[PDB]
């Protein structure tokens, strides 16, 4: 069983997340509510659940006919994986 998990996280698409975790580089996760999160991956699983460090959350909100950016810094966070649209490797 679990040997397949160690295969898929090493060769398959989640090797990106794994590389970002091992090299400690931040990833720009993009969520289903159009929030971005910029964060370090500390752990993940096959559902793309994640434990994240130094989370910066970013989004726009609207006042009338114009938009104002909003921001949060969260020290430690867990992300349920069903909400992830895309994860981007920060250059």
């Amino acid at each position: 069983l679990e040997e397949l998990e160690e295969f898929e996280f090493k060769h398959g698409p989640m090797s990106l997340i794994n590389d970002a975790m091992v090299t400690r580089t931040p990833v720009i996760i993009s969520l289903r509510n159009n929030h971005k999160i910029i964060a370090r991956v500390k752990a993940f699983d096959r559902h793309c659940n994640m434990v994240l460090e130094n989370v910066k959350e970013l989004w726009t909100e609207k006042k009338g006919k114009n938009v104002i950016n909003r921001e949060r810094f969260i020290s430690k966070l867990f992300l349920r994986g069903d909400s992830v649209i895309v994860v981007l490797k920060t250059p």
Partner: protein, 74 residues
């Protein structure tokens, strides 16, 4: 004939356009790998919303459930 997973395993190292079922977003990039659950890794990706590019992204991992279709790009 070509079944879905053999087909997608044939597009690896070729440029594909992954249209998402949401936000009218389509990611155009080189397909590097794919999961049995059809997760995708693209490289050299360009975000397009409604045909207007938001510029090159580098590497992206796209969760399987967001995908409407993958098309090969000639």
């Amino acid at each position: 004939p070509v079944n879905p997973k053999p087909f997608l395993k044939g597009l690896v190292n070729h440029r594909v356009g992954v249209k998402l079922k949401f936000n009218s977003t389509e990611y155009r990039g080189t397909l590097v790998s794919t999961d049995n659950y059809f997760n995708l890794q693209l490289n050299e990706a360009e975000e397009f919303v409604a045909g207007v590019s938001h510029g090159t992204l580098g590497e992206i991992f796209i969760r399987c459930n967001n995908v409407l279709y993958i098309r090969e790009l000639p």
